[PDB]
Design a protein around this nucleic acid. Structure first.
Length: 138
DNA sequence: GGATACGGT
């Protein structure tokens, strides 16, 4: 069962459609910042007043950090791009050291949790409400 | 397992 990002809470597993806003690779993991243009009180409030950021929106509490480890990292690092639409299935949520929600994909070689992320074609109607909502904020 | 909304590798 799919949730809107407004609906997700810490320390569960969930699934959602989203757009990728920001990527960052490192030698430990791959990070996505993603949104479905719904608000969550535990999301970081992104400021439009920061000087010099490459972030162009959405602002306020509208996006979530996803940390991708191991096979998820290796698969996505050079594949998932800023602007892409994704569907993410059976991922874990937690709270960071400051009280903010984030999503995690741990390594799962034993294939216990059936986690996945894959690209979604821009034309898929599953993305329609994301698109409809994004019009509110541009 | 990383470590704060940047950095744009």
């Amino acid at each position: 069962s799919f949730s809107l990002l407004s609906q997700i809470t810490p320390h569960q597993r969930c699934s959602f459609y989203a757009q990728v806003i920001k990527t960052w690779y490192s030698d430990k993991n791959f990070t996505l910042y993603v949104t479905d243009y719904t608000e969550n009180e535990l999301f970081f409030p992104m400021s439009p007043y920061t000087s010099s950021s490459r972030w162009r929106g959405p602002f306020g509490r509208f996006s979530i950090r996803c940390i991708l480890w191991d096979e998820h990292d290796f698969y996505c690092r050079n594949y998932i791009k800023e602007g892409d639409y994704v569907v993410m299935k059976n991922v874990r949520t937690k709270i960071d050291h400051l009280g903010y929600l984030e999503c995690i994909l741990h390594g799962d070689s034993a294939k216990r949790y059936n986690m996945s992320i894959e690209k979604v074609d821009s034309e898929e109607p599953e993305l329609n409400e994301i698109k409809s909502r994004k019009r509110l904020y541009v």
